[PDB]
């Protein structure tokens with residue numbers, strides 16, 4: 001499987017043709033306000049410079065491996081530990097976010113992938129409701145160089161070859177996320193690549209994060225994927241809700 | 252373990268000392284309206300007379316083992332299958348529901364216990380988020396005789412001994428529940444007996460079921476529990492929410 005044409009994803013993974021896939025188009029007016037949704041809790045995300053973290057070009061994204069002890073709660077007793085994060089992005093002059101808002105695709109999107117602490121292993125959790133939870137944020141263009149993102153973007157040139165990897169200093173993972181942890185959309189969907197396993201709780205922050213134009217260009221223009229090809233437009237098309245109501249934590 | 256005596260329940264199952272137990276006191280005023288909560292759907296609940304079901308006095312309740320093919324959806328993609336139902340009751344002039352509403356305990360309560368389709372068996376589901384789901388309804392004294400309930404209650408004399416069981420004709424299991432599947436409370440909780448595992452989605456109907464006074468008397472006055480004593484007041488003490496919000500499917 002690659003982005004941009006065959007093999008068709010259901011022929012790779014029949015799961016990719018399930019009823020409750022991700023990503024989706026968020027339409028705020030149809031989202032259901034649910035006051036039960038409490039502010040996200042993220043502890044342990046402020047990493048010291050040592051030890052160092054693996055940053056890998058895997059041909060589908062750039063992926064940072066997170067150490068044990070990043071703990072996240074979606075609600076009382078509903079806790080998670082962070083595994084990895086990675087980006088989705090477009091190309092020169094084209095947005096590449098996975099989720100969209102009223103049809104708007106954003107320049108890029110960050111995913112932070114967590115495992116329910118009720119499961120010892122990711123593979124127990126795949127397919128199980130709530131087993132995995134992803135935190136997603138939109139990346140937009142802004143006037144300033146983002147210092148937290150720059151720690152990653154300034155290392156992309158060292159892993160430009162598909163399958164290559166570097167070690168980065170520890171950073172504040174929470175500094176990559178939006179201001180307000182109380183404002184988000186939530187629904188249940190899937191991995192957005194094969195194996196397209198369902199039961200994934202998606203939390204999309206209402207607020208975006210801002211990168212410079214140079215920074216965004218760096219993200220789309222630096223990396224090389226499968227073939228002799230450019231790692232770009234690494235996003236799945238939005239998928240039908242098929243009866244799912246997207247919930248929101250704010251009126 | 253018994254209702255009232257030894258051993259203490261945390262000695263049996265550590266999980267019985269979790270923060271997020273059931274049952275709870277439903278305060279409808281503090282409940283969060285959640286328009287995402289749609290009407291529950293049941294498939295396969297209208298059973299024919301054969302094959303027969305096992306109904307058992309297990310010393311703590313009367314439990315009807317349910318057959319395969321009883322499917323229940325909490326919403327799009329939240330699919331379950333019924334395992335069993337059982338009842339909780341009081342005594343003469345003493346109410347015996349497990350849940351209470353604004354402190355009010357009802358004469359009795361029915362539980363339909365279900366397993367998430369993501370799990371092959373209960374011990375995999377225990378402690379996992381959304382692994383089990385209980386539909387719960389209160390039974391109240393009413394003027395007419397409930398004929399759905401008469402089917403089961405007329406067979407109780409046969410299982411008066413603790414640990415005894417009988418076979419009973421299949422019936423419309425859905426007729427044991429309220430007719431309104433759209434007005435309900437929902438919260439995350441625990442099993443109300445050891446192992447008291449959390450991760451359980453409780454759905455408590457707003458509409459009640461009506462039994463006659465004879466019926467309620469049959470229920471509470473027929474069966475015998477451990478030792479020389481009657482099986483009565485077979486309900487756990489209300490448990491503090493500990494910061495959980497109960498959702499309501501209605502404003």
Ligand SMILES: CCCCCN1C(=O)c2ccc(S(N)(=O)=O)cc2S1(=O)=O
Pocket residue numbers: 084111113122123126132134190191192193194195
């Ligand atoms: C045993 C590991 C298999 C699962 C690992 N994962 C993926 O394949 C995969 C694919 C896509 C995403 S995204 N776009 O956040 O949804 C996340 C993951 S994953 O859980 O780390």
Ligand SMILES: CCCCCN1C(=O)c2ccc(S(N)(=O)=O)cc2S1(=O)=O
Pocket residue numbers: 334335362364373374383385441442443444445446
């Ligand atoms: C491997 C253990 C099997 C557990 C089976 N079950 C219980 O122990 C237990 C205890 C309490 C309830 S109630 N009162 O509705 O919450 C339901 C069940 S159960 O799932 O059938």
Ligand SMILES: [Zn+2]
Pocket residue numbers: 086087088111192
């Ligand atoms: Zn992703």
Ligand SMILES: [Zn+2]
Pocket residue numbers: 337339362443
């Ligand atoms: Zn029960």
